[PDB]
Amino acid sequence: AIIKEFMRFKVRMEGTVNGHEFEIEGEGEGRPYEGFQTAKLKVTKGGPLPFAWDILSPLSKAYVKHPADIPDYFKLSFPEGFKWERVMNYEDGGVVTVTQDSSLQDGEFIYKVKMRGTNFPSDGPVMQKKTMGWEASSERMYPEDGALKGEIRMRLKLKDGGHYTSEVKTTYKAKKSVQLPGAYIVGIKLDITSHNEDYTIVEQYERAEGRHST
């Protein structure tokens, strides 16, 4: 009963992408049982970023709407919370790795993110900043070795109508022993709703719902 119908969060990220260091702070809010949230981020160090915002945007699992019959691993993990680690392999060789800790403090989610991005080609759409947001995704979740894993083949939209693809694996682990669901899918749609000219301030909006795999 600790995850309320309406919850806020605070986040801090530090990252290095192609050698460029930076820090981001943000806050957000949403409805964890209805499966939606918004966030407002600001680049507090090392901005403007010389690369697409979209590689950062998918870097808040407590807010996925779960059917009654699929255990909500993310919510059951609280108040302790959970960690996750992720690799995102972009098709042109760019790699993003991420570690993250989510906890609950004073009735607010606290997220802490560290990430590194390497090998984004100088001429590619990330460094060229030619992406236009992610298409909707289906994250395949499944229990493996006392943790919960998610795989996603994700696609960033390109200006010219093409797509730029990243193969994503994430391991989710509760900080306390918690019951695992069976395999299932989280449908997710994230959009950037507004930003200043140089993406030093960005607002984004995500909806996510668990569902069975037929």
Residue numbers in the entry: 6 to 64, 69 to 223
What's written in the study?
Recently, three OFPs with novel phenotypes have been developed: permanently fluorescent LSSmOrange with a large Stokes shift (437 nm, 572 nm) and two proteins photoswitchable from orange to far-red fluorescent states PSmOrange ( 548 nm, 565 nm; photoconverted form 636 nm, 662 nm) and PSmOrange2 ( 546 nm, 561 nm; photoconverted form 619 nm, 651 nm). Electron density maps show that LSSmOrange, PSmOrange, and PSmOrange2 have the same chromophore structures as parental mOrange. It consists of p-hydroxyphenyl, imidazolinone, and 2-hydroxy-dihydrooxazole rings.
PSmOrange could be used for multicolor photolabeling, super-resolution photoactivated localization microscopy (PALM), and tracking of the photoswitched cell population in living animals. The key substitutions enabling PSmOrange photoconversion are Q64L and F99Y introduced in a process of molecular evolution via random and rational mutagenesis of parental mOrange. In mOrange, Q64 forms H-bonds with guanidine group of R95 and the main chain carbonyl of I60. Substitution of Q64 with Leu disables formation of these two H-bonds. These two changes result in the protein that in the presence of oxidizing agents such as potassium ferricyanide or intracellular oxidants and light could be converted into a far-red emitting form. Out of six substitutions made in mOrange to obtain PSmOrange Q64L is the only one located close enough to the chromophore to cause structural changes enabling photoconversion. SDS-PAGE and mass spectrometry results demonstrated that PSmOrange photoconversion is accompanied by a cleavage of polypeptide chain between the chromophore and F65 and by oxidation of the hydroxyl of 2-hydroxy-dihydrooxazole ring of the chromophore to carbonyl.
